[PDB]
Amino acid sequence: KQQLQEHAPSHANLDVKWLDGLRAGSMALQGDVKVWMQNLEDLHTRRPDEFTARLQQSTDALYSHLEAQWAKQHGTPPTASDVVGMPQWQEYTAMLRERFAGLDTI
Secondary structure: OOOOOOOOOOOOOOOOOOOOOOOOOOOOOOHHHHHHHHHHHHHHHHOHHHHHHHHHOOOHHHHHHHHHHHHHOOOOOOOOOOOOOOOOHHHHHHHHOOHHHHOOOO
């Protein structure tokens, strides 16, 4: 499948910045999650266990940004254990990746 090669003008995950956020890249819509799925759509195709490894690099920004930044708030509750679901990504991604069958939020 996909023997012949092809290409066209379009935006890719690389374009979108890390979870840290985008100033001009994507203001109106969310490029963080918007690509979160698309990244797994291509990866998951080959290996699922790796699907999470795709965004794993991006989500890192927030994953740490929270445990680090949020640390100021309390610093006690902030930890890889909490940061896992402390942020919104935990839920957000759960809405798209799960309700992907009908991505409308975007």
